[PDB]
Ligand binder design. Structure first.
Ligand code: ANB
Ligand code: NA
Lengths: 508, 505, 508, 505
């Protein structure tokens, strides 16, 4: 009846999953990791691998003036008392996770400056998040070729480009090497959770599609589901009311289709926040997909009425939420990013992946013109309003103050701007034609709604009771952060901590 | 009838071109740089930016036991006395080029291990070549977006990926920043050399297509042509007898079409070595192009007869030359690289760009099968010979010695592998694959004949006043050899520097 | 009559002087540099060599989001319109000075983070100042031994310690090499300006003591006096009303005695701001001298009444000005810095030079005790008030807020604090005895009052007319900054810019 | 009866001690480190932190052409077969020590050029030694203030000067951070080993003076004694026949008084090489102490007869041994270093600490004069012989050859000089100076006899169960030789590691 057996079964292979697998296997529990696709890492592999794990040994090594209490204060100020026990667990457990992981020879992190996202008590203007060190692929043997490549390769039919592995690729490559090095773990690809197996009300294993045949895998201590969210499932998204679209999502196409969330619902798990995501603006691509637009450093953005309606330097989640809030039947989705030839026709932001302007212009996702009047005609924006919007923005750039949306009055805004700008580095006149308009959509970096869990990642029913044997973390679980993206690395940070805590709970 | 005027006119924007431009502009000479395409850097931007500039302050900072004389000895042992004065100038001038460049705040290099390519007196088993440090694109302002991206982006309709600029992108980004910082240089894109202008036998400027209109640009001290070779021009290649093909060349598509070489011929410049290139094996792509295959660490390679015929770990240029030497009317071009599923279906080498196996298999550039017999059928190799070739190779892997081609008896071979011999691994865990391998290049190396200061020479050895060439616009001093990593950029940089110094006299 | 002749005669050898000398000699003017002592560099050699030269090529190479207009805006917000033409000249000329200097093979700078000092529009929280790169002494031949050593060597009978030359030593070593490399400059030590020589109302040279003989040196284009301020002259200081004391000054003992200022007065030069200095708190030394106290990270400070009266994390100039403002006949000079044994008896700040606690305690500059009551007795502070002051501060540390002086509500305050948990990194309880009290005095990093100059460094008479042939910069000139120390590197930055401009003017 | 207990008790806090403590605590053994003074690091903190740990991952990252066998060959050629098993263990274990340490986030090293000290097979002319990276003190929290400061601060009543921590301060700061980070170690200052405690013939702990009260600390696996040598104990030195003097030693004043060696003798430990030290010339200071003189780049040295008697560019240990060999009742100790005003009155060498010439001249340690005749009078050297010695040296400088002592015929000699021979410079531009030079040391190197795992041995070669020694508490495997930069720290680190590994079995 059972095909194989282990102490801890982990579904998924993102940062959280592999951290949970490591925590279990490092303390002697046999572990099996199941990855649906032919590559480990999921969206985590795509990530910059910034991780919000504050007040740990890593920041101490950088002399950073911060602490557990300062971080706790920051979360409380943003989130309120909703999920305060989970906020506490997140912050307090960070040091221990980092310490455990850094004990492994394959893992080292460092602090990297990148500001927290909201003005509030406890904010770090330079940030407090950490990153895995760049990784020479030869140092993890055959595992490197099993890591999912960066977006600029993975959506163009390519594997890893010739540099070292960095960001998400370093994170996942290092985590895989550490998991393997325990000698207690089995890492499987093309292995898909189908449903959970319950005996006497306790989750005791799972049914799994692999090699076209069904398997039943027994989990003596428990099952950690960290298999992403619903971002790739248009139906579940429509049903929940999630904004954006599956095709605009920056998750790997077809990977995160809400399987683990559904499997948990099927055994009694409650859910929450299904209409929420980790939002971001996306540059629409020729093929209908999107690219993560981050680090805006010029231009402005208008609705279909040719009017500005938000601070374009806002952090990506807040930018996205502002698009959705303003949207009336497609009036803000798409929005149009307007810019001049200051950067040779480049869009003044970082786009991931980074499709050449020529390709966008061929396809009509972007449009160019010698005057704002033509640009309006070609995009359907009112000519007079566009013209007017730009003149007004340019006036604001000259004075160095944006009275309307207060762009450039925040360290996040300033962090990305190049030198020799002007009075305000975030406000630069749009005036040296040709002029361009790029379509911007409501992308995501994964959804953040899912199964309700407690401080140790146990999945809960509607009455708050724990489903024995079942755990969830990362975007399979409803995030403690609610409607907020507090700073860089929260999605990976929360995924990693609660995967660790769930593995610790299974070890008791 | 002059549109504009300058002291030094530089055609091209590769490593050499920008080094020449910097050398001129740093000492006060007004300089104009003309790049044909919309991006600076050419093939140099694609490069790993390893540079063979031995015995300089950079290697001293790394405590490297090497010297000018040791490097000279290495070149003499490989190349003989052919072009010995240029060998001497190359080696002796390296320190000064590096010193000048590193005085600019935007430029720093470091030593990076990568072995020289031939067993000979003066070889460095760990290498002596240097590289520019990684560069944060925000540190050179608007120039970063004007640098040609890496191959893995540039042939898939993409710009720079999110990391730092490294290799050729660091080299060109840093060189551009240094050239701009002089305040004496004008950097132009979409500006194409059409022909040279001569008055009383001296090159005094050039005719240039830009903005759809013709321009005439005056060069008081001279014209440095470092606009690449003929690699992208099938006609010139066929006429010269150059092996390989334009479509297989790793140069940027349509950029290096021999324009500067032709313009030099047109005014009396002699040429040499036009049938030579910087060769490399290439993995054939679905669209007919190729990818640079370097750092082989497994598999074996067979001709169309299903037989091994070379050491597959040879340096890329020597590998290429071996393909050409063995080729009888397509018997070795293509060759087939045979490998198993040890790396999950990946090919056991570094391929640039790195197209996924699935794409190759969909297109038929690669072919897969559960047995060697089916693999033979699907590729048109003899089944018996293939089967036999593999069994024999696997025996050699087990013993740790390849008696037939001596693979794995050299530090280059070992450098890319952490078994009895790291370079010899049995092919046995199906599915099995065969990938088509072609005769690619990293640019051609034939061109205008020059002297030690880069002056272009006529057939009688006299110098064409006012005209200079370096990089692949010039015939390389290295003849039929690729001595070690970084020679193409190294020679381009030194002679571009020396030409600028000559124009300054 | 004339002993020798040159185009440009430079008096002094600090950062300004050598920058002026370079600017002249690089464009073909014969130059003679006169240094009073046996070593080049003065207080500039002692410095950290942070230089406030905003919006230049150096910051562009670090991607810094700042500009000339932003820096101008910062100065205007602090200084008002007093000296606005000089503010403009300072900011606008920075790029050209840096460019000229970096064109020399011996000179390179880099940006280094260190915050600006006042909350105001145009502030850089991370800073915008630059520094010379560390220098291997072998790279400038015999010149290295002619540079004045750092404070931690120069006041203890020592020459350079074994590392590379850094901070001020790098600055002066590199500047000297660049000046020498022109082949147009003569660098002299033990050569003292005595007085200026005037013919038909124009300064045409100077009288100079060297080798015990008097010399008369002719200056065809002019004389640049950048020979420091009056900091080492108790008489001039007392006459002008300058706070602090010569003995407490961090300038080299006996070097900057106001000679150039006096020589300028003697030929009609007006003066201003003679009662102002670049102030800082100083840790009183056994021998009566002081040490620059910067980067406070703990403790508190009380007046003679045992009460706090300032934010102890203030920038050093502001801290100093607060000491002087509060001082009533020695009630705040000295003040007492109170701290516990958290750092093993070390004082929680950077002190330059860094005299060991044992030496202070032996001499009585510092005093230690097991209880605050004894500590009070031994220092003459009221026991009740001290006890009370500390309890209240410790309460504030526990809450993480200092309601009384708002310490730790500013990026400068936070910049120096180590991670030590705690709600606020700048507030740490004083509680683990023994307890110590260190005497703190009103030190300086030079005075800033002097000869009135225009935008090209010409010395002016009371009516604003220019004294033909005479220029001043650095602390020989009255600073454009008035009563403010805007940020790190202003003293060197102003000295360098106006020395450059003066040399350019002489070249016309 | 026991005050506290641990698995591994380490006495001392130099590079060896902390490496041993780390090796133990990193693999889960509870560790207690005892430092006698109020600061960690001892002489190791003073050091340049050059470390002779050849053939490791660090040198591979620098592309250095060297290996374990090459280094072994070097040691064998110098030392012979005396202690060959320990030579082997030293060389073979270097990679593993470096690898373990560099796995800690707080530790990173890099190769830094500095030549090996003897002409012999296996020598590296550029060196093979490594150094810890410079360290920002804020990165190790409260530990920075617990590291002993550099000599130029520590003997003048000062703490750390304002730069980053470098050399020995970086080494010790980084090692302390790594030891603390394990969470298995307790670091104690002002805790002095008094004597060892033995039960049933096995060392099981130690008695320790701390806080004016005696403590007894139990060591379940063992006691590593790495508490320096006898350098600061004039009695033990005189008894053993050690040349030089305690006050001239560059160790911290009063720290290394041979306590651990005596404690080991008291329980049966044999000793060897007590008359040997890591010698160096020292510049005599006004207060009677000395300063390490290294990197001589000019001048010459005479005995009290006004005659040269050695190559002044010899490595410091060889220089010292030559002073001792020539000494007849003070005829060479002191010697006089003679130099001109080429460097403005500076002495042409690096001196640590670096006392100003004015201070020496006030005190009469140095003497200056306008002629060699006056200089001779003021120092008591024969005028004729001095004059004659200098003329002859200046002739040798003009030819570029020193026939008498062969100065400047070796890469060490040249390394410190940027003339026909860079190491030979005429002494001719007055004023002239004579500085007194004495026989200093960088610690003594005699001590307890140990085996390849650092176990302390009795006279018959049997191991004293539970007792280990490394660094200068142990008799060095190097005998009468200082092979190259970093041997003292290198040996201390390797055998401390091995001892901790042996305790872990
Ligand atoms: C000579 C020495 C000492 C003992 C040893 O074993 C190895 C070395 C080499 C490194 C130098 C050090 C002495 C101090 C030096 C000169 C520095 O201050 C910088 C480099 C250091
Ligand atoms: Na790509």
């Amino acid at each position: 009846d059972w095909t194989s057996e282990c102490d801890v079964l982990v579904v998924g292979s993102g940062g959280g999953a592999l951290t949970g697998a490591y925590t279990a296997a490092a303390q002697g529990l046999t572990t099996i990791v199941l990855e649906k696709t032919d590559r480990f890492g999921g969206t985590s592999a795509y990530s910059g691998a910034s991780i919000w794990l504050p007040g740990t040994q890593v920041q101490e090594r950088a002399g950073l003036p911060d602490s557990t209490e300062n971080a706790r204060t920051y979360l409380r100020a943003l989130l309120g008392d909703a999920e305060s026990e989970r906020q506490d667990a997140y912050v307090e457990t960070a040091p221990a996770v980092v310490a455990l992981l850094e004990q492994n020879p394959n893992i080292e992190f460092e602090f990297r400056a990148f500001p927290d996202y909201y003005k509030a008590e406890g904010r770090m203007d330079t940030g407090r998040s950490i990153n895995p060190l760049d990784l020479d692929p030869a140092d993890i043997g055959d595992l490197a070729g099993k890591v999912r490549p960066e977006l600029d390769q993975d959506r163009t039919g390519q594997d890893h480009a010739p540099g070292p592995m960095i960001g998400g690729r370093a994170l996942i490559g290092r985590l895989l090497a550490a998991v393997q090095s325990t000698g207690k773990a089995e890492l499987r690809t093309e292995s898909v959770l189908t449903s959970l197996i319950v005996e006497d009300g306790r989750v005791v294993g799972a049914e799994v599609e692999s090699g076209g045949e069904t398997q039943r895998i027994k989990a003596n201590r428990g099952v950690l589901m960290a298999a992403g969210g619903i971002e790739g499932n248009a139906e579940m998204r429509e049903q929940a009311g999630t904004p954006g679209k599956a095709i605009w999502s920056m998750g790997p196409f077809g990977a995160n289709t809400g399987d683990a969330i559904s499997a948990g619902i099927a055994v009694g798990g409650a859910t929450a926040l299904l209409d929420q995501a980790w939002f971001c603006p996306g540059v629409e691509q020729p093929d209908g997909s999107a690219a993560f637009m981050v680090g805006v450093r010029g231009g402005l953005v208008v609705d279909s009425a040719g009017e500005r309606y938000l601070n374009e330097s806002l952090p990506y989640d807040q930018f996205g939420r502002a698009m959705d809030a303003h949207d009336d039947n497609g009036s803000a989705v798409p929005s149009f990013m307007i810019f001049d030839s200051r950067e040779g026709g480049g869009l003044p932001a970082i786009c991931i992946p980074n499709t050449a302007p020529a390709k966008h212009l061929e396809a009509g996702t972007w449009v160019g013109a010698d005057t704002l009047e033509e640009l309006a005609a070609k995009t359907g924006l009112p000519a007079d309003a566009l013209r007017s919007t730009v003149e007004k923005f340019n006036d604001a750039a000259k004075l160095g103050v944006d009275e309307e949306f207060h762009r450039g009055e925040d360290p996040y805004d300033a962090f990305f701007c190049p030198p020799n700008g002007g009075a305000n580095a975030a406000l630069t006149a749009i005036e040296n034609g040709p002029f361009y308009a790029a379509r911007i959509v409501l992308s995501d970096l994964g959804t953040k709604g899912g199964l309700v869990t407690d401080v140790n990642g146990r999945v809960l029913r509607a009455d708050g009771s724990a489903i024995d044997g079942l755990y969830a973390a990362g975007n399979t679980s409803a995030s403690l952060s609610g409607r907020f993206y507090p700073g860089p690395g929260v999605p990976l940070g929360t995924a990693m901590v609660f995967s660790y805590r769930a593995a610790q709970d299974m070890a008791k």
